[PDB]
Amino acid sequence: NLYFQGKVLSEGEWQLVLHVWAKVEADVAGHGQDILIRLFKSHPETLEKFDRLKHLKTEAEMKASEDLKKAGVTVLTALGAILKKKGHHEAELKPLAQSHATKHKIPIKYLEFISEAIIHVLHSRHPGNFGADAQGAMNKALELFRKDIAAKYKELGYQG
Ligand SMILES: [Cl-]
Structure with a gap:
C-alpha cells in the first residue's frame, strides 16, 4: 500500500478522515440527502442557492426530490475527491472557487454551515x-x- 504523505493533518488524522469517508461513499446518495436536508433545516437561507430546489418546503418533499438527491451526490463526491488529496488540493480548489465565488456567490460562512451538517x-x-x-x-x-478555498476566492477577485 504505497505511502502518500499528506499536509497539515498527521498521517493518522488523514486515515481517520478517509476511513469515515469510505463509509459515506458506500451510501453517497443517502448521506447526501441527510446532509443537505440538515443544512436546509438549520440554515434555510442556503436553500435559496439551489435554483432547482428552492421551492421544496417540507422534509417529505426534500426526501422525494431526485434533484436534491443529485445535488447531494455532486457535493459529497467533489468533497471526497478533495479529502483524498490529503491537503494536496490546490488544483482541485481552483475551478470550484471560480464557480462558487463568481457564479453562485457562496459565502465561506455556508461552507462552515455544511461542515456542521x-x-x-x-x-x-x-x-x-x-x-x-x-x-x-x-x-x-x-x-x-x-481555509484554502477562502484563499482561492481572494486570488480569483472575491472576499466571500
Ligand atoms: Cl474514533
Missing part, C-alpha cells in the same frame, strides 16, 4: 464508529478545505 450526519449514521478522534480529524480536514 456533515459532522452532525456522520454522528447520526455511524454513532458506533465516529468518536472524538474521528470527529476531530474530520473537523481539521474541513477547516483546511475552508
Whole structure:
C-alpha cells in the first residue's frame, strides 16, 4: 500500500478522515440527502442557492426530490475527491472557487454551515464508529478545505 504523505493533518488524522469517508461513499446518495436536508433545516437561507430546489418546503418533499438527491451526490463526491488529496488540493480548489465565488456567490460562512451538517450526519449514521478522534480529524480536514478555498476566492477577485 504505497505511502502518500499528506499536509497539515498527521498521517493518522488523514486515515481517520478517509476511513469515515469510505463509509459515506458506500451510501453517497443517502448521506447526501441527510446532509443537505440538515443544512436546509438549520440554515434555510442556503436553500435559496439551489435554483432547482428552492421551492421544496417540507422534509417529505426534500426526501422525494431526485434533484436534491443529485445535488447531494455532486457535493459529497467533489468533497471526497478533495479529502483524498490529503491537503494536496490546490488544483482541485481552483475551478470550484471560480464557480462558487463568481457564479453562485457562496459565502465561506455556508461552507462552515455544511461542515456542521456533515459532522452532525456522520454522528447520526455511524454513532458506533465516529468518536472524538474521528470527529476531530474530520473537523481539521474541513477547516483546511475552508481555509484554502477562502484563499482561492481572494486570488480569483472575491472576499466571500
Ligand atoms: Cl474514533
